[PDB]
Amino acid sequence: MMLYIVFILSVIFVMGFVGFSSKPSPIYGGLGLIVSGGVGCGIVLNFGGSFLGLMVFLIYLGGMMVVFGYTTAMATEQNKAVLGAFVTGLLMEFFMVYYVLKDKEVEVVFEFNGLGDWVIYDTGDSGFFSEEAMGIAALYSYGTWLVIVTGWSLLIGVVVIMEITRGN
Amino acid sequence: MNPIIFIIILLTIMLGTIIVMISSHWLLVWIGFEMNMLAIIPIMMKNHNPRATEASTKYFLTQSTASMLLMMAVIINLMFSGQWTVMKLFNPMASMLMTMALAMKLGMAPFHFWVPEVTQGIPLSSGLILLTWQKLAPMSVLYQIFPSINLNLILTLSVLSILIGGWGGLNQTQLRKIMAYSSIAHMGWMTAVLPYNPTMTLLNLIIYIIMTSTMFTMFMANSTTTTLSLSHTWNKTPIMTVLILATLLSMGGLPPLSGFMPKWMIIQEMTKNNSIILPTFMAITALLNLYFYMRLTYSTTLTMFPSTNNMKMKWQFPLMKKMTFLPTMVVLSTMMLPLTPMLSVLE
Amino acid sequence: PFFDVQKRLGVDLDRWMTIQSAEQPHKIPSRCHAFEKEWIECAHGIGSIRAEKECKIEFEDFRECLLRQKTMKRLHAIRRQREKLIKEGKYTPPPHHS
Amino acid sequence: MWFEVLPGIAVMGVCLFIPGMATARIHRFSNGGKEKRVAHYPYQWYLMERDRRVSGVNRSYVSKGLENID
Amino acid sequence: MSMVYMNIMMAFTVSLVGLLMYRSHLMSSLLCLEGMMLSLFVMAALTILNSHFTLASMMPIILLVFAACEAALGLSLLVMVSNTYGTDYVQNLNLLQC
Amino acid sequence: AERVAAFLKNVWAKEPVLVASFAIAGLAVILPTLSPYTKYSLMINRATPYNYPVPLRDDGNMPDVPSHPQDPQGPSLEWLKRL
């Protein structure tokens, strides 16, 4: 059952989404989105992306999601619909999991397969480097245009937010 | 707001739209949209009142959702073709989300409920940017991916926009809402001819921008935002009523004014493709636009509405508004029909 | 592009990351470099109306190397047949497959 | 006096020495008296797996020298 | 496609439906908006890593940087909505009907 | 000449931290242009052999390409052993 680690994580990934998509109180909604983020990194790590997976923890979970929780505790004033949506979500997940595990082929918009994610991995690698790392480091040698527009947007984010929040 | 920061924010709105038009990569197209939405919110919040705050919120949620759908189309297109180039999409499901993402950004029906409300809650100058400049970026992408757009989807969004823009405008007294519904109606024409001749999509866009910019400029000169407040203009600036009459008649497509040229050329490019029912239905439904334009002509220029006593104090001061390019825009909005063959410069 | 500023100025703003058979750092190839190259060289210059018909063979191969749909159907068939014969006493896996 | 503070330091010092001493010894015990192989990059992993096939016994740390060559 | 893609692709659908059905809180919907980018982040990274599209390994980071900048702009509006009506309820934002 | 001294001696008294920050950042932007060893950084980076040196089919007219690694022809890393 360790060969299907990626699929097991993806199932937990969806269940978390059904958690905060049903929209419980914001405190619990943010809690469910942290669980999905951690599971999301786990999936990316098992596909060979280590820098990308860790960037999720540092920037997404330890960054944005901290600001989300920080802003919730200060501007949120700490039902049947929630339970109804949550139960509806799990049932659809169960049936999708049930069928892809029975006949190993499901057609919903796209043709999905059920053999196992491991069957599409590359079979040959003998490099003395990390291919993912080389691509990201190319941001400075190849992505000159990307660096300029991204940096300017971040600078404008500082200017814009101060304008919006002044109130006068 | 500091004047220098106002220039910087505006140039970022332009830069976002320019990045979309010069990019051969879907990531830079998406970055262009994000830089555009980030910069335009501060000009909508500039007056610091609850209505502006509500308008900026409804705009953010709509444009944020539209951008997420667009990025989902790009990734699906990457999975099925292994490339990022800005061209025809290689999956029908990617095309639907891409076509629907752009429809939401444009404001086409039935993704239209935010255009009347956002345009109403922001100043006139912000509305002018929203209804003219913000339409360039989505139309640029449609110009490039039209070979793969679902015909029944693009023509269905076009027909609903023409209808909903027409009926919505009849029941309005606020000027900002009237232009918003007018903007929805003209979008349907631009996307109706897109599968057949994209050149006429640009011509109708160029003419619409010129005419719409003229109307907002004349409203801003007298600080008029309601039908009644516009009816005092005859007693303050008589010349400005004659210019409003001419532009309103132009927007309605009445010959021999400029606004008849796109309606004329779009009907031509659709009958060549044996499309007879749609152009007729489109042309007849456009009479709804001509009606509530004519209503403003009755209460502004063709009749003299009641005035107030304090108006006499206004006669002693001039107009200090900028009214930039107003003499040039008004002439281009009315006297360009004899130059119709010039559309070939757009090819 | 709507405006071809890059071609006019001869500046490569964003064309270096459009395709996966372009120049990569340290000459690292993509898994489907050969298939992408073949389709690109088939459809070059003839417009997309013709390429949709006269380069369909290359395109189907490229899409087979991307999503591997046909291969997974074939492996799935073999696994079922082996499983069916396994639960009848009619098959015997060799020592090096166990 | 000040030197009566040392006995607490010795206990705290010893507890921080066990984790380092234990890992070094356990690796050598489990790797036939050698350091545990370090495989950060794919090439190193490929060699280690190859060593597993060459050992006869399915163990990466059993090295075969010239005496295994004819 | 594959088995993992189904759940990632179904996680985007859940968040989209969650974003299109507001309950009361504005903060709740912003989470559904940041769930959408998380699913897109994972789905793109899976495609790029599996195909050895080396130069595209930087794209998911750019997706994360802009999506977080947009999220910051969203929270700022939520704060300014709460400083006016005393809560982040969407039903209060109904002045523009007329 | 006296205006600058008065200005510099005032920030050095009231804002020593900022004065240090700009001096350090200013050196990071200037020295690489004037440094004679910046060219050796590129040569070291180009000399590192991550990939395999695929050999070239011999046609006869290639006197600058060695037939064996230990032949004297081809690029030399002697400058690196002495750096």
Next chain:
Amino acid sequence: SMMKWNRERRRLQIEDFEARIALMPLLQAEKDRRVLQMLRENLEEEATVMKDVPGWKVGESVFHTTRWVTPMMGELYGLRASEEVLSATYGFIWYT
């Protein structure tokens, strides 16, 4: 001091990298024979498993081209033990 030591470390990296280059030809030759053997081993089992199927060709390519295509994990370890498959798929990612 840092400049000197870093410079010595680059000369050491080249020496370590050149050892890999000197060995790649032997490792490439071994890998080619190991990949082909596993493909042939699967070919035999496919023939036995599907000798009586309604219209099945043994070892039929799914590509129109006749060019050599690198096998994926499913084609090599399709019918092997889970432990061997687990090592060849997640072994590197899970090592330490």
Next chain:
Amino acid sequence: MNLMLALLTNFTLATLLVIIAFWLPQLNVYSEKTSPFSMKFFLVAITFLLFDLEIALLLPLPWASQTANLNTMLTMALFLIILLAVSLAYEWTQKGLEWTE
């Protein structure tokens, strides 16, 4: 598998201490006892987020120094850091980094 066991052990151990901490004294039987949004705090969080994102673009610098285009690489590296310092200056002069009303 090793990293998975390490995480399982640490959090499993922490849970045990927590539950036996809430129950061990409950093996005892003690008599039942019976019976504003701040704007500046929000701006600190947002300023951290925008700074934190810019750090994400700087983390791959050590690998970026291994390229053969050091002139281009060193130009963009100093551009990102300079832009990050420009954001700090803008907040500093616009009274963003203040705690007085």
Next chain:
Amino acid sequence: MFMINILMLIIPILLAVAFLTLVERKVLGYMQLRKGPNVVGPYGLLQPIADAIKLFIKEPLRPATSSASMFILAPIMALGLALTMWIPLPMPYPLINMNLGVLFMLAMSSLAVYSILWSGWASNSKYALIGALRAVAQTISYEVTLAIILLSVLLMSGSFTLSTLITTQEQMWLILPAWPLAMMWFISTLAETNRAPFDLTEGESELGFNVEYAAGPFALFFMAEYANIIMMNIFTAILFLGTSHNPHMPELYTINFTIKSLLLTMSFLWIRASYPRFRYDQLMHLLWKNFLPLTLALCMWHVSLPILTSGIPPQT
């Protein structure tokens, strides 16, 4: 054997934290002209054990928390993450030999803010929330300088591998070429762990967030907090005071490396006894107006310095 390895790392950590409480109370005592614990066991060697038993058989409060599930999640997360930050530390051989270990420690360290934020919610007290917000704003502010300073140091090392820092310092400590960064790294670690002169949480007369906790749950927050004090000082010694590694005598490394890690942990106790406490607005200005301008400037200097001397480290 790996499972034995994990326990050989966890239990000694907790024992070290237990006797750090004693050492702290006695070093503080002698700097104050007194003794500290010397009655409970010889030289107070049984004082830590008495304190532990007392807390775990004392009745806990568990007030009417708004959730009652965050109240139990907060100490699990704090202690769970605190032990997890030790697994990649080379002493000299890591339990888990990560390629991006330095980045792993930043990632896990930035998650410790949730236990501060969650415990604020659970307390259900409006005032206790304000204290949690100030603590959270302090932690995120000072991990901006931790990330940039670490990046600057790694430019002289070449990788995020923690064991490569040992090779980098095989001829000389990094404290020599990068002492200005070491100063701002050392102070940034005090602010992260809410240590004097940066302990506003425990700094009564202005506020703490963990005020509603007593007995065992309180000890769990305490244990996690002190394990982070040892861990950050072990990180500092590896980063700036590299110890030479002899593969044949690994114990030699561990003894020298432990002595450095203790001396840096005692420096934390030394600094607590010597200075008064910062004001909240004053430690924020120490970061956004003094450290950050220098950290950004030194980052520019350290990106360019290796290039202009031809001293770029190897990638591997």
